[PDB]
Amino acid sequence: VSLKLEDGSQYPLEGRLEFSEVSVDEGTGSVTIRAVFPNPNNELLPGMFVHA
Amino acid sequence: DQAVSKQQYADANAAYLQSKAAVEQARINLRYTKVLSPISGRIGRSAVTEGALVTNGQANAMATVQQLDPIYVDVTQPSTALLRLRRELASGQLERAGDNAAKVSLKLEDGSQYPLEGRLEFSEVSVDEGTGSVTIRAVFPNPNNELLPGMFVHA
Amino acid sequence: ILKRLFKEGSDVKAGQQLYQIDPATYEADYQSAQANLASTQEQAQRYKLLVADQAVSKQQYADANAAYLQSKAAVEQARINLRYTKVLSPISGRIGRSAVTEGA
């Protein structure tokens, strides 16, 4: 996986995929997928809206 | 002069110190009532008054004892502008140097400047998912109660 | 809350002193437990010194050693709360803002 950043630019590091969650959401009907990314400096911080 | 035993003194000393512990717990329970102000500062109104029943760790408060001789000013900033700023400061287009990376010099709601200047504290590491903004608090001194906690200001 | 014993924004270690919750009834339990231990320990050591030539029984020593280990477990369970009122960082990393200031 290689996520887009918030403003619409590419992120330099590529990450590992894991955890295909099996439980479908009730109203939306959308499974959830959990990637993981390393960062040496505080480049992307938890909470923002990204695109993988 | 060894009339009673040493173990018979030791368990009696243990009972004496346990009873001192029980007296100390009873007097701090008696000091929980007659409630001491845990802090110095300006007190507000009384949320409960004469006759209102209270319980151990209730939901609503009784009096908000604030002190405000320094203040904290939580200052929001959206994550897109901070991301663009980190981009153009990691680039060679711009630099942040000097002593003036910590001054703030806020202004009030009506456009009136504030005569003192403050110091910029930490930045919060995580944004809020309902507004997309970090918080960057600061410290400002007001010697004569110039601004009240809870206003709206512009850093 | 008595004292905040860190600064916000700086990274914390594992097991760092952060707050100081008022140890009024959590130090007096520790003094009572230590007071019971300071007698039961002497009882257990004296019966351990006496069983080596069989002055007291080999069952009364077992009763005294049981009372000693129960009192030591009471001291340790009463200092667990005294460690709990020194609230420690369970992880190591960046800390946010203090939503509850001192005095509340």
| DSSP result, B36-48 | PPSS-SEE---SS
Judging contacts by C-beta atoms under 8 Å, the chain A residues touching residue B127 are: 45, 47-48
Experimental resolution (Å): 3.8
The kind and range of the H/E element at C78 are helix C60-84
Cα C3 to Cα B32, B68, C6, C102: the distances in Å are 19, 18, 9, 6
Q: Residue C45 CB: number of other CB atoms within 10 A? A: 12
Collect all residues with Cβ–Cβ distance below 8 Å to B87 and sequence separation of at least 6: A9
- CB distance A44 to A37 below 8 Å: yes
DSSP state of B70: E
Candidates A7, A47, C96; CA nearest to B128 is A47
Q: Please state the φ and ψ torsions of residue B154, each to the nearest 5 degrees.
A: -115, 115
Between CA A6 and CA B76 the distance in angstroms is 18
Q: Residue C89 CB: number of other CB atoms within 10 A? A: 16
To the nearest whole angstrom, how far is the Cα of B80 from the nearest Cα of chain A?
6
Over its C-alpha atoms, chain B yields an Rg (Å, rounded) of 27
Q: How does B128-153 read in b/e, with b if 16+ C-beta sit within 10 Å? A: eeeeebbbbbbebebeeeebeeeeeb
HSE-up (13 A, CA, CB side) for residue A15: 16
Which residue type is seen at C44? A
Technique behind this structure? cryo-EM
Q: Classify burial at C64, counting beta carbons within 10 Å of its beta carbon; exposed 0-12, middle 13-18, buried 19 or more.
A: buried
Collect all residues with Cβ–Cβ distance below 8 Å to A1 and sequence separation of at least 6: A14, A15, A16, A17, A35, A37, A52
Collect all residues with Cβ–Cβ distance below 8 Å to C28 and sequence separation of at least 6: B21, B24, B25, B28
HSE-up (13 A, CA, CB side) for residue B74: 11
Candidates B126, B124, B123, B113; CA nearest to B155 is B113
Between CA C62 and CA A8 the distance in angstroms is 74
What's the maximum distance between 2 C-alpha atoms anywhere in chain A? Answer: 38
Q: Which domain holds residue C61?
A: 24-85
CB contact under 8 A, B83 and A5: yes
Pairing assessment for the beta strands A33-36 and A16-20 based on DSSP bridges: antiparallel
Using CB atoms, which residue from B14, B20, B137 is nearest to C97? Answer: B137
- CB distance C94 to A46 below 8 Å: no
Between CA C41 and CA B12 the distance in angstroms is 14
- CB distance B103 to B152 below 8 Å: no
CATH number of the structural domain spanning residue C81: 1.10.287.470
Tokens representing C91 are 């992880």
Candidates B74, B66, B42, B64; CA nearest to B151 is B74
For chain A, the chains sharing at least 3 beta-carbon pairs closer than 8 angstroms are B
CB contact under 8 A, C9 and B122: yes
Between CA C68 and CA C33 the distance in angstroms is 11
DSSP state of C88: B
Closest residue in A to B80 (Cα–Cα):
A7
The reply to whether A6 touches chain B by the CB within 8 Å rule is yes
Residue A31, SS3 per DSSP: coil
Ramachandran assignment for B51, one of left (phi > 0), alpha (psi -120 to 50 degrees), beta (any other):
left
